[PDB]
Amino acid sequence: HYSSLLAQPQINKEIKNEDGVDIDRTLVAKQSIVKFELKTEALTAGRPKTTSFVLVDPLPTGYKFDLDATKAASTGFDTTYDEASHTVTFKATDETLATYNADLTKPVETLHPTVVGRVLNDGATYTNNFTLTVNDAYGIKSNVVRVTTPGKPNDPDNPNNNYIKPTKVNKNKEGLNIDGKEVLAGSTNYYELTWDLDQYKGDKSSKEAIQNGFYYVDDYPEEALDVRPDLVKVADEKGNQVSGVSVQQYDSLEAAPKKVQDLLKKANITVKGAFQLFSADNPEEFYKQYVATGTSLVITDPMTVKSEFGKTGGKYENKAYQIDFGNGYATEVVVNNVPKITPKKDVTVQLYQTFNYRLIGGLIPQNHSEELEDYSFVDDYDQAGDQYTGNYKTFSSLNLTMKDGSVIKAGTDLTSQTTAETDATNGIVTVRFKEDFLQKISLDSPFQAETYLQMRRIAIGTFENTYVNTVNKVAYASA
Ligand SMILES: [Ca+2]
Ligand SMILES: [Ca+2]
8 A cells, every 4th residue: 555655656756957958877077066856646545544744864974954944945854963863854844744734535735855065075976865654554665866077987877087187297309208307598498288178078067157267277397487368378188279278477376366366266276476378258158169078278388498507507396287067176386407508618838839729619418308409619819919819629528429329429529510710800709509409319318519729828927708609599708
């Protein structure tokens, strides 16, 4: 008699987001409001009078139960919550018990409560069921329902699920990862920021979670580098361009719109000084086209070494963040070092005696980022006192390896790979390494060279002589 008390499907647990969309066995963003709806079908006619009508729902871990939201959605019940066992119980009021017992010869439609909370963890599966016991004589156990948040691989319901890991790598223009490498003055860091969106494929988040926006933050070292605002570009993982991503630079977080600071503090992101904020313009179109389709974006964010910072040297760090649906995830930190270049000069007298200016070049340290395209010696002598004979010899100052594999020994004459020229107007000798020899050198080998400029005194007295070394068209004085 009691197995036919509730009607056709009897009971049915449903799980929805805040737009009322069935999200069972699908994927939803972290912090999403998730409604457990404990539907119960009409009571058959010819029943006994209903003493009790009790639904008990043990809630899953990671689901933060909201008491006043679930009470408002469960009129006709009285809501009790056991915090120690994550269990919520709904007991039908005597007023809807009365409407269940108004005429037992007709079917009556029964009320149902709704649990309202939000999921709190990434890469978690949330399971739920509930039991309904009536008149402590029957009792029915419901079907299990599932929702999953992105962040865990090998999810059987979503085969694209994985770790939400935004990545940042430093590249030159050839695409070589230069993480941790040395970077010479005037060079540019072609930073690659990945906007990790693969795992969000199949997401059914609400329309207001999407309205929290989609952003990318880059905490760039403002004290060492300058942004190249016209070379920032957002592309998908293949190469096609992305228009719908705007970029704004802020010199400090405290000098930024209060919306932006609220954004970062609700994602637990804090920035050292200046940062960039990539925005989605219209988040809804950005969602349908990149988030819901699981197509990650790539942001090339090139920045160049300041002039002064190349002369002082030091180290700098870049770090980025990804902010989807309001939730923040952080890249690892990429580190680079700028070497301080300081060439020196000695001499090696008496009227018309020949002598050499020894011009030692700057040390290009091991494990550098960019190809050498310029290593030149520039000597501005006093033509009224000394004159340049026209002979000179350039030697490596250390052991040079390169791409073929050979190692050029320390002290080897490299003058058959140089090119001099003379400016008689100002009195300037310029010994240059050509490009095709410099661009034959491995990026992991060091580089240093010296030239001996043969000169002779043609006047009495002492005379000043300035020497300037050049590496990739940045000029270093000397002492
Ligand atoms: Ca910064
Ligand atoms: Ca001169």
